[PDB]
Enzyme design. Structure first.
Site, mmCIF file in Angstrom:
data_model
loop_
_atom_site.group_PDB
_atom_site.id
_atom_site.type_symbol
_atom_site.label_atom_id
_atom_site.label_comp_id
_atom_site.label_asym_id
_atom_site.label_seq_id
_atom_site.Cartn_x
_atom_site.Cartn_y
_atom_site.Cartn_z
ATOM 1 N N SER A 1 -1.298 4.601 0.753
ATOM 2 C CA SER A 1 -2.224 3.639 1.030
ATOM 3 C C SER A 1 -3.167 3.694 2.656
ATOM 4 O O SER A 1 -3.910 3.109 2.603
ATOM 5 C CB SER A 1 -1.746 2.380 0.822
ATOM 6 O OG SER A 1 -1.496 2.189 -0.403
ATOM 7 N N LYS B 1 -6.678 4.236 2.509
ATOM 8 C CA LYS B 1 -7.558 3.053 2.496
ATOM 9 C C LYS B 1 -8.213 3.163 3.787
ATOM 10 O O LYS B 1 -9.186 2.481 3.833
ATOM 11 C CB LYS B 1 -6.700 1.671 2.137
ATOM 12 C CG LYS B 1 -6.235 1.651 0.812
ATOM 13 C CD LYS B 1 -5.540 0.483 0.537
ATOM 14 C CE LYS B 1 -5.082 0.123 -0.797
ATOM 15 N NZ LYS B 1 -4.071 0.814 -1.356
ATOM 16 N N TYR C 1 -3.466 -8.227 -1.779
ATOM 17 C CA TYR C 1 -3.527 -6.896 -1.605
ATOM 18 C C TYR C 1 -3.648 -6.015 -2.684
ATOM 19 O O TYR C 1 -2.876 -6.269 -3.909
ATOM 20 C CB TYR C 1 -2.227 -6.214 -0.926
ATOM 21 C CG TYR C 1 -2.386 -4.615 -0.490
ATOM 22 C CD1 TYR C 1 -2.957 -4.425 0.720
ATOM 23 C CD2 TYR C 1 -1.603 -4.013 -1.200
ATOM 24 C CE1 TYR C 1 -2.913 -3.127 0.966
ATOM 25 C CE2 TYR C 1 -1.478 -2.688 -0.818
ATOM 26 C CZ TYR C 1 -2.162 -2.366 0.097
ATOM 27 O OH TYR C 1 -2.194 -0.871 0.493
ATOM 28 N N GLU D 1 -5.382 -3.072 9.370
ATOM 29 C CA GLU D 1 -5.019 -4.307 9.426
ATOM 30 C C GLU D 1 -4.900 -4.544 10.838
ATOM 31 O O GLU D 1 -4.557 -3.600 11.490
ATOM 32 C CB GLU D 1 -4.148 -4.666 8.617
ATOM 33 C CG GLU D 1 -4.289 -4.741 7.096
ATOM 34 C CD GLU D 1 -2.921 -5.053 6.189
ATOM 35 O OE1 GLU D 1 -1.981 -5.476 6.368
ATOM 36 O OE2 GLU D 1 -3.172 -4.557 4.954
ATOM 37 N N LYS E 1 -1.498 0.370 9.571
ATOM 38 C CA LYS E 1 -1.311 0.608 8.206
ATOM 39 C C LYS E 1 -0.307 1.392 7.674
ATOM 40 O O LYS E 1 0.005 2.501 8.152
ATOM 41 C CB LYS E 1 -2.782 1.328 7.425
ATOM 42 C CG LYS E 1 -2.873 1.182 6.009
ATOM 43 C CD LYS E 1 -3.145 -0.253 5.561
ATOM 44 C CE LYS E 1 -3.383 -0.247 4.029
ATOM 45 N NZ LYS E 1 -1.828 -0.369 3.506
ATOM 46 N N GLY F 1 1.696 3.216 4.443
ATOM 47 C CA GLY F 1 1.523 3.997 3.094
ATOM 48 C C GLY F 1 2.555 4.570 2.457
ATOM 49 O O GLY F 1 3.366 5.327 3.326
ATOM 50 N N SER F 2 2.673 4.402 1.240
ATOM 51 C CA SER F 2 3.819 5.072 0.545
ATOM 52 C C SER F 2 3.009 5.549 -1.004
ATOM 53 O O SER F 2 2.226 5.133 -1.564
ATOM 54 C CB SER F 2 5.031 4.062 0.216
ATOM 55 O OG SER F 2 5.225 3.552 1.400
#
Length: 363
Positions: free
Chosen positions: A63, A66, A149, A274, A317, A319-320
């Site tokens: 993510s 994004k 989310y 964010e 941010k 992400g995985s």
């Protein structure tokens, strides 16, 4: 001020126990400090082949992808191709269900459409079925009231945001964001000649990599970005200091992505990015990263008009993917930032704690 020698010590002293505690085979880290990236590599990209992590190793961002979407959508706004205040239906006239009235591109981009779920379900295997899914969706909340989310929200934003350009998402992203920023080793589809650089992910001891999903408007957003630590470093520097980005619409799009659209407790939602106000204590950031909070439907306060980027921000941010866990954070006021790419998905709070500790050392 901290020296490069001291910074190297801080990073090693933080990362080495983290990798041991979380059973992480390999990590690539970049710290942005005093106007340049500093690179640190640890462990293995491929255990069985005994390949080390290098600054060329490709990791799945999950993510953090994004953030690229958000900047791409910001660029489209800056070009005049879209407006966040436009209705979703302007960009998808076949979406005729009346529950969509009053849902803006903004809401899709920032997870406030009113309950779009985390995932697009797996029976969505083409655009006809993607339409049927969104047509059938019944909002749990009115627009602009609840943040949940959701890949099904921002993924659709990214697909619609590029429609005026006439390009699919992958090509739009490459043409308008990656190439201008010279991110020449950042991929949705890793080319053949670059596969030797692709790390393996690890999950419960098994080597794994992301799979492609069914062809359709979201497929590239879903397959996600793969990149190395150098390109991610330069991505962080572009977002931290957009004043050095020459292309006028891309510079504006970076700013739009770090603008504050909604407040949700101690955080603010941007486009992909964010933010929290800086200074912020670690426990605030760490506790917000827990999945019980990060996945919850939470009330929002609208920022109308959106607040342009606040330099005194923690911007971040996580992400995985099944086999990878990554984190990025930066503080524009201080011109410091960090990228941590790993080939195991270890808990997000642990990522934040380690990143915070390293950046705290530099202030």
């Amino acid at each position: 001020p901290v020296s490069e020698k001291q910074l190297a010590e801080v990073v090693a002293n933080t990362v080495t126990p983290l990798m041991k505690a979380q059973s992480v085979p390999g990590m690539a880290v970049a710290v942005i400090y005093q106007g340049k990236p500093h690179y640190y590599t640890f462990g293995k990209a491929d255990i069985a082949a005994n390949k080390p992590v290098t600054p060329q190793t490709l990791f799945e961002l999950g993510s953090i992808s994004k953030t690229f979407t958000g900047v791409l959508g910001g660029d489209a706004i800056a070009r005049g191709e879209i407006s966040l205040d436009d209705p979703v239906t302007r960009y998808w006239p076949q979406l005729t269900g009346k529950q969509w009235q009053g849902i803006r591109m903004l809401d899709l981009a920032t997870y406030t459409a009113g309950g779009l779920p985390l995932q697009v379900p797996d029976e969505v295997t083409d655009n006809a079925s993607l339409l049927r899914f969104y047509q059938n969706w019944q909002p749990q909340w009115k627009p602009g009231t609840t943040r949940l989310y959701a890949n099904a929200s921002i993924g659709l934003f990214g697909a619609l945001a590029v429609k005026p350009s006439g390009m699919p998402y992958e090509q739009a992203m490459t043409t308008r964001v990656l190439k201008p920023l010279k991110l020449d080793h950042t991929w949705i589809n890793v080319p053949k000649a670059e596969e030797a650089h692709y790390a393996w992910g690890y999950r419960d001891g098994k080597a794994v990599r992301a799979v492609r999903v069914s062809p359709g408007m979201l497929d590239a957003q879903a397959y996600g970005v793969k990149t190395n630590v150098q390109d991610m470093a330069n991505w962080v520097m572009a977002n931290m200091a957009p004043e050095n980005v020459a292309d006028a619409s891309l510079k504006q799009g970076i700013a739009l992505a770090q603008s504050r659209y909604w407040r949700i407790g101690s955080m603010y939602q941007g486009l992909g990015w964010e933010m929290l106000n800086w200074p912020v204590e670690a426990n605030t950031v760490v506790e917000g990263s827990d999945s019980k909070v990060a996945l919850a439907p939470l009330p929002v306060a609208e920022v109308n008009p959106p607040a342009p980027p606040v330099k005194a921000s923690w911007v971040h941010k996580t992400g995985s993917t099944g086999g990878f866990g990554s984190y990025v954070a930066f503080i524009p006021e201080k011109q410091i930032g960090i990228v941590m790419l790993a080939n195991t998905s270890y808990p997000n709070p642990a990522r934040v704690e380690a990143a915070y500790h390293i950046l705290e050392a530099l202030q």
